[PDB]
């Protein structure tokens, strides 16, 4: 892992296999159609972030301070989501 | 604030169909156009389906061969084509909009419309 920085609409539309991305600010995120396996985010922040479609597997969120985040279609549930601060977070749709 | 429009409630027979059309106006900036949810007596809203962005869609597995979604962005509308309306599966149907503007994500909900089944 390498320390993450603050990216405006990162829209990292490529798939990741790295384990961790410790350090995150991610203001106005625009992630779309990214397939994480074995990926983790620790000590990360998300404001006005947007997830379109993530086929996440074995990936969990730790110490993530979501604020005003909409996920639309995702594989994220309490099972794949570790304890962390979430406010004004919405999960419109989910997949099996 | 985006004004959303709800419609299409009432009695339909199994084998018949209804068009529940979502529409919205004001402050629309290439939005994810309203998808559909089913509200039961119990406090909860089941996902139905969405064709909100691009030409792609996700339908719930629970609505396979029952709820079909078609979208016309040039109009900011979504049409739910209700079919296979088995008598027990009634609900209040809701439009769920997502704002993709410069101030970040925002969402809107309508009051919903009640659909029942004729027999
Ligand atoms: C998500 O964000 C919205 C808006 O940023 C939050 O809505 C605000 O929630 C607070 C309670 O935490 C409430 O504040 C109220 O505002 C009036 C405005 O005149 C003011 O007299 C008081 O301060 C009153 O408590 C209200 O529901 C709402 N306020 C505004 C200005 O929108 C919402 O709380 C956030 N989500 C969560 C889970 O907190
Ligand atoms: C994923 O991101 C890549 C890289 O930004 C996009 O590829 C670019 O497409 C544009 C517009 O045609 C070009 O000007 C660039 O040369 C491309 N860059 C690269 C690195 O290939 C790509 O379109 C994005 N794909 C999706 C699905 O969003
Ligand atoms: C969870 O993460 C937050 C920050 O993302 C941690 O709180 C930070 O702690 C450092 C300690 O040097 C302070 O400088 C920061 O100002 C704090 N930030 C916030 C937002 O509180 C917190 O310690 C982490 N907790 C765990 C259990 O990992």
Shortest CA distance from A71: residue in chain B: B105
Of B32, B71, B68, B75, residue with least CA distance to B55 = B71
Torsion of CA A16, A51, A63, A15, to 10 degrees: 0
Distance (Å) from the alpha carbon of A88 to chain B's nearest alpha carbon = 10
Domain CATH number, residue B82: 2.60.40.10
Cα–ligand 2 centroid distance for B6 (angstroms): 37
B54 touches chain A (CB under 8 A): no
Burial of A89 (0-12, 13-18, 19+ CB in 10 A): middle
What range does the domain containing B8 cover?
3-117
> What's the rounded Cα separation, in Å, for the pair B66 and B63?
5
Count up the domains in chain B and report the number. Answer: 1
Within 10 A of A77 (CB to CB), how many other CB atoms are there?
11
Is A15 close to ligand 2, i.e. is its CB under 6 Å away? no
**Expt. technique:** cryo-EM
The domain defined by A1-96 carries CATH number 3.40.720.10: no
**B81 and A24 Cβ atoms separated by less than 8 Å:** no
- The phi and psi torsions of A90 (rounded to 5 degrees) equal -130, 140
> What's the rounded Cα separation, in Å, for the pair A24 and B107?
24
Question: What 3 state SS string does A64-79 have?
Answer: EEEEEEECCEECCCCC
Is A90 close to ligand 1, i.e. is its CB under 6 Å away? no
Cα–ligand 1 centroid distance for B90 (angstroms): 34
> What's the rounded Cα separation, in Å, for the pair A45 and A84?
11
**B6 and B110 Cβ atoms separated by less than 8 Å:** yes
Which residues, other chains included, contact B20 with Cβ-Cβ below 8 Å and sequence gap of 6+?
A: B7, B8, B9, B36, B79, B80, B82, B93, B113, B115
Distances in whole angstroms, Cα of residue B32 to Cα of each of A9, A70, B78: 17, 11, 10
B5 touches chain A (CB under 8 A): no
Q: Which residues pair with A45 in a beta bridge?
A: A65
A52 touches chain B (CB under 8 A): yes
Distance (Å) from the alpha carbon of B17 to chain A's nearest alpha carbon = 24
Which residues, other chains included, contact B84 with Cβ-Cβ below 8 Å and sequence gap of 6+?
A: B14, B65, B66
- The phi and psi torsions of B75 (rounded to 5 degrees) equal -125, -10
> What's the rounded Cα separation, in Å, for the pair A46 and B23?
30
**B105 and A69 Cβ atoms separated by less than 8 Å:** yes
**Domain limits, chain A:** 1-96
> What's the rounded Cα separation, in Å, for the pair B12 and B117?
5
């Amino acid at each position: 892992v390498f320390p993450g920085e603050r990216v405006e609409h990162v829209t990292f539309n490529f798939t990741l296999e790295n384990q961790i991305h410790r350090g995150g600010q991610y203001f106005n995120d625009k992630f779309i159609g990214l397939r994480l396996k074995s990926v983790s985010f620790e000590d990360s922040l998300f404001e006005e972030c947007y997830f379109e479609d993530v086929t996440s597997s074995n990936t969990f969120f730790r110490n993530c301070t979501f604020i005003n985040t909409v996920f639309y279609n995702t594989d994220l549930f309490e099972y794949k989501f570790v304890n962390s601060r979430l406010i004004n977070s919405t999960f419109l749709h989910n997949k099996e | 604030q985006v004004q959303l429009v709800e419609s299409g409630g009432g009695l339909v027979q199994p084998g018949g169909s209804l068009r529940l059309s979502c529409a919205a106006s004001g402050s629309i900036f290439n939005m994810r156009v309203m998808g559909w949810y089913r509200q039961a007596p119990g406090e909860q809203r089941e996902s139905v389906a969405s064709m909100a962005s691009g030409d792609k869609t996700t339908y719930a597995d629970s609505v396979k061969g029952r709820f079909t979604i078609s979208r016309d962005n040039a109009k900011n509308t979504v049409a739910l084509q209700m079919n296979s309306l088995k008598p027990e599966d009634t609900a209040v149907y809701y439009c769920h909009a997502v704002d993709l503007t410069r101030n970040g994500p925002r969402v809107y909900w309508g009051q919903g419309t009640q659909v029942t089944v004729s027999s």
